[PDB]
Amino acid sequence: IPRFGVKTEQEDVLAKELEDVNKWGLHVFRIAELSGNRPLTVIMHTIFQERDLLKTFKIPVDTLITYLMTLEDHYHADVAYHNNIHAADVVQSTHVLLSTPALEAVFTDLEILAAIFASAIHDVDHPGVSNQFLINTNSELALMYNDSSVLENHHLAVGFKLLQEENCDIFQNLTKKQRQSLRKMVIDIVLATDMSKHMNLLADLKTMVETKKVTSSGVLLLDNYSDRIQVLQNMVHCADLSNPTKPLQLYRQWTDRIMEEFFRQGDRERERGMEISPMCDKHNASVEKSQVGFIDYIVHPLWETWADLVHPDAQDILDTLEDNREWYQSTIPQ
Amino acid sequence: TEQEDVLAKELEDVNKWGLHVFRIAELSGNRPLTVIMHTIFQERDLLKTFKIPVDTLITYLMTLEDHYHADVAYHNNIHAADVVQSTHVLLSTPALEAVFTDLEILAAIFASAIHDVDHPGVSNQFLINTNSELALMYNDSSVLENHHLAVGFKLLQEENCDIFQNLTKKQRQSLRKMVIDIVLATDMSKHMNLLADLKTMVETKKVTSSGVLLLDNYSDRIQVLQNMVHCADLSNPTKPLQLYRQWTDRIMEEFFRQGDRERERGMEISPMCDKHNASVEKSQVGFIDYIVHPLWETWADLVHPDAQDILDTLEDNREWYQSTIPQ
Amino acid sequence: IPRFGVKTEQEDVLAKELEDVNKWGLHVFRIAELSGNRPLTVIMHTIFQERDLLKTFKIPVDTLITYLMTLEDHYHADVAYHNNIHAADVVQSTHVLLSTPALEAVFTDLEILAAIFASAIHDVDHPGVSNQFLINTNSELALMYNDSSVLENHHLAVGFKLLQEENCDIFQNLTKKQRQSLRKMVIDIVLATDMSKHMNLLADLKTMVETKKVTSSGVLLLDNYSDRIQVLQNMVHCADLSNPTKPLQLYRQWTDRIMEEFFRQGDRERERGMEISPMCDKHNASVEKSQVGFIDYIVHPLWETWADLVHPDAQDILDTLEDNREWYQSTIPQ
Amino acid sequence: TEQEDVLAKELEDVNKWGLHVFRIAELSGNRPLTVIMHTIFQERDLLKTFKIPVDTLITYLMTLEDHYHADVAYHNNIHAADVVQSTHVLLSTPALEAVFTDLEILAAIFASAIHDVDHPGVSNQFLINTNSELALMYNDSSVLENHHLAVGFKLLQEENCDIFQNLTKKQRQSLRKMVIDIVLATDMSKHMNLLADLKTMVETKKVTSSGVLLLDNYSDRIQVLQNMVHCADLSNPTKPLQLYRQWTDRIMEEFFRQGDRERERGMEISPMCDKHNASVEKSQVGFIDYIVHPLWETWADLVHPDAQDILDTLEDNREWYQSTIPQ
């Protein structure tokens, strides 16, 4: 019943912040505070209303909100980076990428719903530790998933399982064919968020750029499921790795959070007498140098390629990335 | 190791009722369950007795502690540490000197450590009402309690975590049964009938030629251990007021958060979970009058009279809250 | 399965057999054969139609059939006794007991649905081995359910979980109120099928018969949930232990099956160097003596008490039981 | 006795392609996986090398065999015993002599033993289409294959079933990875790529000073092991005609049962699963021509001329079934 799916007297200020939902650089942390730590719920609701997804897929509003609160509730409040705010941020970022001029009218409502839903559940129930940590401790999770994309497989399973809780099935009115297509796309997208698949994804993105085709309109031509799903996988992957491309003020908050999470894993590994994972040793860390390297070897190569695919739609994003790259470089203790 | 001195000194009270469990949490860097459990195992020489390699014990303790939710106000690793330490004290009670075997002692302490592991901070009914996977798995029956048990045992399977690797098959079988029995008894839905048998036992109470309580059959020995851990789980109001108020603050925060969740979901708000219509003080007095005092009064009878100081503290605490009940 | 809209020869014969669905002693085995091993699906369907349960609870017919076949599919065809035929028999038996004159107009449609649904899923996915066998082998099932009513808890979990497969939620149209009540009653009933609960269950039944109340009609009076569910638990429990009360021809087929299942467990326990459970040693067995003891110590005491509760409705059932008891008795070799 | 000797006499062909596995199934009281595995373990001296207590091996084997479905026509304990035995023979081929370590041998054999455990007798697609809990768990990806691994590993935890209890952490970590890699490769959705990489290796075939195959990295090594088990899994058509025919009747019966289930549920009937419109003989020839022969031809190329007889038996059977095609 509430205007943003969540009760809030600061609804005025919250409403104002949400006006930037279509903009790169939304004040997601402010929205998290104003919504009473319900950024995923309010942002998803706003986006669904904005894209008219409730009517298009006959999703009852109470069901949508119940599912969103349930999903958000399963992101860990104690985890510094992989929590509901990161989830809300990836959802909103994907939302903007989907609206890029170069992709206008390219994707169907079902593909849009898939990319957005995938973004929302992509890190649900994340414990704050890597796949390797879960594997080396012989966790029940790694056992169930045979050490392959353990967390990613788990995020998907949880995201879908929650649809079964009371009044949570937001896809109850989709046909069997829509549900099967939606389910396959969502799975393909989330499994692509595993960094072990980064290089092959990027390689394929580049190949697409090299043989890039556009329709009579000025938009990208995507013929087969293979090319369509590949763009969606890279889009959500880009959103997941979009932190360095956001206004510095936001970027630095993300860096502080992921570092806090990395160090916590590092402390746990140390306690258990395990080899400390890269960048997880608070006693031997180089936050700034690590951000520069992160940009140079991962983020920039990816976004430069994405920028080429949708040229010149993402020039400003690429420019921000570079300005941010320099800032961290300039703060490296000599 | 500057603080390593404060922690060590603080731990000197591991045998005293009223340990500064919260200070220990901070000093140990939020590892009260691990530190306290380790101290007690060393103290009771449990590692040698059951040949538990030290590295295996600590790895399991950290693993168990890691599965308690840091974001939950009351049902976290601190509560777990508190219940273990309290069980440890109740075990050392005079009236039970040399009564229980080292395996029964291990069981009571182990059960205490894992009794609330992976608690989500919401009640069984909330899990049931939402059709949660946990409730579906356990058929809405002692949902969380069954889960705590399953998780506690399952974690023994992680790398270098099997602390019972050197127990015999017979020992494992007996330990497993006792633990299950003890933890399932922590379900408040078992409280009443649990208390009845505790009274009935105090009525026909018998003593050995040593002045120590006489426990024959499994049924009686397990019932005593069950109530012992149950008393430890409901020992908050018996601790010095200062610790007690911190526990009340914590449980109320947890309750209110559940109520906030129920409200935003359009669900009926659970008793005492509505922050807009609460009676914190009145609920504590009712909690003491109808549950905690009747329970501890009886335990104080069974182990008469080493628990006298505990019961007197309880009654003083009740009066204090009573005096704070709004007009 | 039909043709040109008319029944096939087999279907017609099956239909004729189902005419005895309201009678004690249905040829359930012939029905299993005639239905292509779908006794549970056909008997449940016949009963739902007969009691107008589809309209009452707005259960779409295709959803009911799909769920029934799915549920039946999860009973093990390789298990001699605890299979879909046993399930179908308990369902049909419960169905007959529900119609006893002494209980006319006593239970609500929801309570009737609960008793029948509970009967249908009460042994689903039964492995053919006892709880103790599962406990002694440290099976995953035993681990999950803490060695407590392991199989009974599993039967319920599976029965409910299957409602989540494609087009299987037969309760999709019930209100949350109806669903919570149905679920609680179903759970209470199935958990009551654990033999460990037999004695206390019988004690409470005797107690009820002592304080038994009636009305202007020879109908029983059940004031609260406690007495209503108690009667329902014992009813299904009686149905589960009704083999000895059936005509000898049927009773003997059940005895052969339970003995085969027992001996199979015994052989597995012997293979493994485990102590052979009571009556599971095919080399040291007393089939006749065991059936006599089964009747004297469990079955007769239970049905005698139930007969009292609904006197004289169960007179013929009791008489049949006693005749069968005498037959097995006279069969004991000296 | 008699049936005991007949069995022991049959087990003598354990190292030969064409073992009378069905006869062994009958003679052992439906314990083909257990007796054949144990025999092979003795034959390779695996109990000694890895210090596997015999009671633990027999207990695990019976347990694993117990988790294969007796009511499933093809994917049951007999198929598992067969794939195990076939892999055992393929491991002894001359071209591979002295190549694999004992752990890699164990991996290939263990993987073979558990590769289809708890198979329901229906395809991944059927499980996905019905929204089964299994498919939800594994995200519709290699659902059954992932499940077989999970169950095979989980069963080591039952009472006295951990046949790897004496392996070092290093051995366990390596064995686990290899087994996972091998079993996941048995998913037919990976056939094409597997055959491609195999052919590539056949073209860049690096022999050794002993004429045996040369495998540097873990990648080449596992690739051969994965393809070996895959070949074993798809070896029915290369066995003596009397065996091959029994396998065909079984897979057809399993396919038809799935088809009847799909039909009764109003689902599209899967390829070759419609008993009312089938071409058994025709389908076998197609299976040999597009998958089995292409795979074994490449394998024979890798171990040339080691599998010449196996390959010839295949072409032979192919012609038998072909001539069986009515017109």
Ligand SMILES: [O-][n+]1cccc(C[C@@H](c2ccc(OC(F)F)c(OC3CC3)c2)c2ncc(C(O)(C(F)(F)F)C(F)(F)F)s2)c1
């Ligand atoms: O697992 N995972 C999937 C998606 C995203 C993320 C967070 C994501 C990430 C997001 C924001 C980050 O910082 C900032 F943008 F907030 C950040 O900082 C660090 C790499 C140094 C990392 C990572 N991408 C690759 C990561 C690796 O550790 C790498 F070595 F490449 F750096 C990995 F996993 F590839 F080995 S971590 C983590």
Ligand SMILES: [O-][n+]1cccc(C[C@@H](c2ccc(OC(F)F)c(OC3CC3)c2)c2ncc(C(O)(C(F)(F)F)C(F)(F)F)s2)c1
């Ligand atoms: O479920 N559960 C099991 C063991 C312990 C606890 C916490 C335990 C508890 C612990 C410390 C408490 O306060 C303070 F001692 F810290 C406390 O305060 C409240 C009753 C008002 C409650 C409870 N025992 C019974 C509880 C009930 O909600 C009751 F209605 F009785 F109050 C219940 F569950 F019985 F209905 S809650 C909760």
Ligand SMILES: [O-][n+]1cccc(C[C@@H](c2ccc(OC(F)F)c(OC3CC3)c2)c2ncc(C(O)(C(F)(F)F)C(F)(F)F)s2)c1
């Ligand atoms: O576990 N379980 C629950 C419900 C029903 C059944 C089958 C059920 C049963 C059903 C038909 C039987 O025979 C015939 F009626 F088909 C039958 O024969 C045997 C007791 C010897 C037993 C049993 N009820 C109690 C059983 C016990 O093994 C007993 F010791 F009493 F015999 C038990 F479990 F009580 F120890 S088994 C089994």
Ligand SMILES: [O-][n+]1cccc(C[C@@H](c2ccc(OC(F)F)c(OC3CC3)c2)c2ncc(C(O)(C(F)(F)F)C(F)(F)F)s2)c1
């Ligand atoms: O799923 N699966 C994994 C491993 C082995 C098997 C049995 C295995 C198989 C084994 C023995 C068979 O017959 C006989 F050798 F026993 C047999 O007959 C059929 C192809 C028609 C099939 C299959 N391999 C590929 C199969 C396909 O259905 C194909 F379309 F190719 F025929 C699949 F899955 F590729 F689409 S089935 C099945």
Ligand SMILES: [Mg+2]
């Ligand atoms: Mg992720």
Ligand SMILES: [Mg+2]
């Ligand atoms: Mg608890």
Ligand SMILES: [Mg+2]
């Ligand atoms: Mg049963």
Ligand SMILES: [Mg+2]
């Ligand atoms: Mg397979």
Ligand SMILES: [Zn+2]
């Ligand atoms: Zn992410």
Ligand SMILES: [Zn+2]
């Ligand atoms: Zn507790």
Ligand SMILES: [Zn+2]
């Ligand atoms: Zn039954």
Ligand SMILES: [Zn+2]
């Ligand atoms: Zn196979």
